[PDB]
Design a protein around this ligand. Structure first.
Ligand SMILES: Nc1ncnc2c1ncn2[C@@H]1O[C@H](COP(=O)(O)OP(=O)(O)NP(=O)(O)O)[C@@H](O)[C@H]1O
Ligand SMILES: Nc1ncnc2c1ncn2[C@@H]1O[C@H](COP(=O)(O)OP(=O)(O)NP(=O)(O)O)[C@@H](O)[C@H]1O
Ligand code: NA
Ligand code: NA
Lengths: 349, 313, 313, 348
């Protein structure tokens, strides 16, 4: 035989991994399930081919390094990585992970979630996020499609290609993503002093979506998204407005007609009132007032699962070997080659 | 239910959260098709924009009006009076490689047009290719049902064509989808030539055995019509139906193939066929087998989760 | 003002309650034009639908995206970096009947296409015909500015082509508008052949003079280039510029004329022209005169009305 | 030869000359022209209706009604031109006083003062009182057929769709340039129409004068109705089951609930008395809609209200017989006969 091919995509992962089956794809990778002939179990394998562009190499290095370092129950791990023995031959990287049964996106398209499952899924998202933030890292791209699930109701966050080390006084500009509907307003307004609070907003959007099986702030353009946000939260108060840098967004916001706040129980008449209370606090326009991940976990909505003694944090802040932003793609390729060497046959530490 | 200016008549089609009825526009007494779509279950935005922009093409179904009552959207389109393509050509009195070439040429040009505009159809079954009337003129053919079609766009929505950037898997997916369109034209070509479908013997075939045939990319090219079918036709189908999309022709490359370009030097001999209802049955079974997937398991109780267990003590 | 994904550059056009700026799409670094329209003063719905449906035509400006901030609408379109047709032609070192005919043929086909779709442009000034690039290639021509264009529709909005069905004055107005489109191509043709405007000698011409020339249907076909310009061209221009729209050619007929069908064999001899700004000034004066209306009187106080006078005391 | 305006011949010489384009509708083209007899410029509308029954109806309805009606706020017909024999008649030219503009063109070029809005509304209602007193429905009131002079005199025109009132009894498929002024019961096809449909149109016109925007636009009736309900709110149970059929009655029931938008939130700067009357004109339930005599007596119009100078028709108007089933050939005979009085040599 030869290399198995999934949907015209060659997956050169044999002979260890065989019997490939398509399970999904994003804007950057194609994911298959495969049989691990060493561990006698089926696994997930994402193929990416990033080396022609700096930003794609960033995604690959960021995801690999962060996931190899992180250890948490609600964060997908990386078990293995496949690539060519020499750097010149390396065109593709294959990331091997635990096979999760589905993701929240697919689930929400096929069924409704019970009020209890919504609560528990939210709990696990926030539990994983607490660990991420404690490592001084921003995920920056939380969405239903990268919350992986098993039917046992275990949830794991994946897809860390856009993740950065927190730094307010310092990665989205023009980078293609499949969906922008989970992004905080300050990102759309380009306020540019982003904090952990952008992740909390995404979680808010995800909670509202679990509650209704609809995105709360869709739109083709940021203009439309922002208008959807204001159409529900109402015009920002003066106090929020002058909490903003720049001026161009401020004045656009000031140029806009007044819009009243729409009561959450009008949007979601049948949602648990405690869920709506937490939703209001996550979907706060002013990022400085938006609830923080540790406070979110302690909110009455999550009381059945809240247990600070079993909500672990990272031992230390995460750091790349150096800031990645200005590294040429050629250099990033070397760094990816080196980070992946440990999974090569015959490798010694 | 949407306008007192039309008389709604019989159902002429049913789709996913949709149904199509023939209707008569009272003021002009002109006939139309109206496709009702449940917007609460199926967002028709993409289909509408694609029909708006590209429906002016002669061989794409034309969108003449849109109604929206809040829950349902209603697409007023031209009425396909001539029935499905195969229902015509497998029943008609004279059919040869010449007519089949004219057919692939008209549909091919239209698919090339869509792909060049960044549109993939993705549901290009023969049953979604209709005649607008009974003339049998290849020019009267229309590609219909863009319910699954997709327009390539940039990161901020900007209309994009594959010619003159988008994320890399998005581009591979567009290529894969273009290949699937071509592969469906290959199925159509095979069926026109052979008088039966390449991967199914009939409606009683199991999804399992159809898929293994498809996966192996094996199909008969001998016996029956094939004995007298031109070699250039055989070459073309083998390339359209090819196992890996890499060695599979683009729409442009189909239109450049000698079987299509040299339609003058093509045999005019009569082509046989299996019984129409059998062919349609095998066709549907083939697409059913292609687009089916094992239903996904139901969620378990929260208490199936080890973490959740730790919390209930 | 509408997207941080674009860099907005210089103003490149100004229209009624509109302004057009060159812009650069950051992600792809590609240049575009964006037309801002104040919708509180001007409903762009008609223009947008026409561009959506028909902008796929190679020689109609393509609509790539639409932003709407509530008060303004932003149309993202191809950038016409070749500039206006006449600015290009009258700045060329060489120009001939053959080039002129290829220009007419390309624009004529596009107008024929529009009319067959039930669209009339209604503002087909030469300055609304641009080149997408610097090549001077006829297929790089684009008809632009559909701000006044109209789509024919039935009583309940159903998309209509002129092929009864609609109220009689509405049909007569379609025919009249079609004639105005063709007459405007006749202006363009006259100007390309003669090197100056048929009814104006320059921007200093009075509106009254231009109009009486237009109303009499008088224009010179002698002196200058006309001595050597093909008789067949002379005949075509006469029929396009005819006084009554009844004896005026349709778009289809223009394209069937000997001077257009024999475009490949027309003379390549140098056509002379007057000064560019003079001719453009004469062109603007012609359209100003055509489209100008005597401002209407202000309302008087209510008490100017005899009935109202009866109601006071 | 005959003068030609925008490609259309206007064979009205030699009495009427120096023709100039002033407008058009869906059915006619209108020019101004010099009357060499009365030495003044007049308006002339050319129609060519004889190929279709419904176009013949429009022509006959407008001609017969306008020749009969006599009112300051209703356009008169002074003269009619057509061919001397019926077989030669293909066109009819209706000659009227030249009005300077109409409300449609006016609202495109300027705002109206609060006082003019009031007075224009007064004149609309004054003319309508006369029409309704004649037992006639106009059925197509809109800004474009309210003619105006800059002296502020207003005249209703365009009577091609007008009918004798008869609730227990011509819109279906009839092309009009705009449907935005039509009452909801027309859109729901309740088919028991009364004088109240005209009051609805006037309310729509009053709203448009107050904002320079149509209040209930939309491509389709579906859209127009959703615009209406989105302002007035969902119809009450009392109003809902005041409607025949069920097909209509069931649809609004299927629709989700909408609250009433207060008129002062829609028109925050409008005179409150204007909004109170607007409310009464734009009621969903035709039976509860204010009637024309009541409208005239409303406080908003108090400065102009004078029943002693708001004249009514002497008698109900009647055509010679119902027109609806008359073939176009017969209608042409009737149009020929109705226009005979304006022919040279005519004796009565
Ligand atoms: N370990 C896994 N088990 C099961 N499914 C997975 C697994 N990892 C990824 N997937 C699926 O594959 C899809 C794409 O993975 P992802 O890591 O998001 O790809 P990406 O293209 O690098 N980024 P993105 O464009 O943000 O989706 C997901 O949305 C999941 O459906
Ligand atoms: N007597 C008049 N004086 C000045 N302008 C007039 C006069 N009569 C008509 N007009 C104008 O011409 C336009 C058309 O007149 P109208 O009688 O409504 O035409 P119609 O086509 O028979 N019906 P419609 O389609 O409802 O407009 C009007 O809207 C006015 O602008
Ligand atoms: Na970083
Ligand atoms: Na009547």
């Amino acid at each position: 035989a030869g290399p198995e091919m999934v949907r015209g995509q060659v997956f050169d992962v044999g002979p260890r991994y065989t019997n490939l089956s398509y399970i999904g794809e994003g804007a950057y990778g194609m994911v298959c399930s495969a049989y691990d002939n060493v561990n006698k179990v089926r696994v997930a394998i994402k193929k990416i081919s990033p080396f022609e562009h700096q930003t794609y190499c960033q995604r690959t290095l960021r995801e690999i390094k962060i996931l190899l370092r992180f250890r948490h129950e609600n964060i997908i791990g990386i078990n293995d990585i496949i690539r060519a023995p020499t750097i010149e031959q390396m065109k593709d990287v294959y990331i091997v992970q635990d096979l999760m049964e589905t993701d929240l996106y697919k689930l929400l398209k096929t069924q409704h979630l019970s009020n209890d499952h919504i609560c528990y899924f939210l709990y696990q998202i926030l539990r994983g996020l607490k660990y991420i933030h404690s490592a001084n890292v921003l995920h920056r791209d939380l969405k239903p499609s990268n919350l992986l699930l098993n039917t046992t109701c275990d949830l794991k966050i994946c897809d860390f290609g856009l993740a950065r080390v927190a730094d307010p006084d310092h990665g989205f500009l023009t980078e293609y993503v499949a969906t922008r509907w989970y992004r905080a307003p300050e990102i759309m307004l380009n306020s540019k002093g982003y904090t952990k609070s952008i992740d909390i907003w995404s979680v808010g959007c995800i909670l509202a979506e679990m509650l209704s099986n609809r995105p709360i702030f869709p739109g083709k353009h940021y203009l439309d998204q922002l208008n959807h946000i204001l159409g529900i939260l109402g015009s920002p108060s003066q106090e929020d407005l002058n909490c903003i840098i720049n001026l161009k967004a401020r004045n656009y916001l000031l140029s806009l007609p007044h819009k009243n706040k729409v009561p959450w129980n009008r949007l979601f008449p049948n949602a648990d009132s405690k869920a709506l209370d937490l939703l209001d606090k996550m979907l706060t326009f002013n990022p400085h007032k938006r609830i923080e991940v540790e406070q979110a976990l302690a909110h009455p909505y999550l009381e059945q699962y809240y247990d600070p003694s079993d909500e672990p944090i990272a031992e230390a802040p995460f750091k790349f070997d150096m800031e990645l932003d200005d590294l040429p793609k050629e250099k990033l390729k070397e760094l990816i080659f080196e980070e992946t060497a440990r999974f090569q046959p015959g490798y010694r530490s | 239910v949407f306008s007192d200016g039309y008389v709604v008549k019989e159902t002429i089609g049913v789709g996913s959260y949709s149904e199509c009825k023939r209707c008569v526009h009272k003021a002009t007494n002109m006939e139309y098709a109206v496709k009702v779509i449940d917007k609460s279950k199926r967002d028709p935005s993409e289909e509408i924009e694609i029909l708006l922009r590209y429906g002016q093409h002669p061989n794409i179904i034309t969108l003449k009006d849109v109604y929206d009552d809040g829950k349902h959207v209603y697409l007023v389109t031209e009425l396909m009076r001539g029935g499905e393509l195969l229902d015509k050509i497998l029943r008609q009195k004279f059919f040869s490689e010449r007519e089949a070439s004219f057919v692939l040429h008209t549909i091919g040009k239209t698919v090339e047009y869509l792909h060049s505009q960044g549109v993939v159809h993705r549901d290009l079954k023969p049953s979604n290719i209709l005649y607008v009337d009974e003339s049998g003129n290849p020019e009267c053919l229309r590609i219909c049902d863009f319910g699954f079609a997709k327009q390539l766009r940039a990161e901020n929505g900007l209309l994009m064509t594959p010619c003159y950037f988008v994320a890399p898997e998005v581009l591979k997916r567009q290529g894969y989808d273009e290949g699937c369109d071509i592969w469906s034209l290959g199925i159509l070509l095979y069926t026109m030539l052979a008088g039966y479908t390449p991967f199914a013997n009939g409606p009683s075939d199991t999804p399992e055995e159809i898929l293994t045939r498809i996966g192996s990319g094996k199909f008969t090219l001998s016996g029956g019509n094939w004995n007298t079918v031109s070699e250039t036709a055989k070459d073309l189908v083998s390339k359209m139906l090819h196992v890996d999309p890499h060695q599979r022709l683009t729409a442009k490359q189909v239109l450049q193939h000698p079987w299509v370009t040299q339609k003058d030097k093509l045999p005019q001999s009569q082509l046989s066929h299996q019984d129409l209802q059998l062919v349609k049955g095998a066709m549907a079974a083939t697409y059913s087998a292609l687009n089916s997937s094992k239903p996904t398991p139901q969620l378990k109780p929260i208490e199936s989760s080890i973490l959740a267990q730790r919390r209930v003590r």
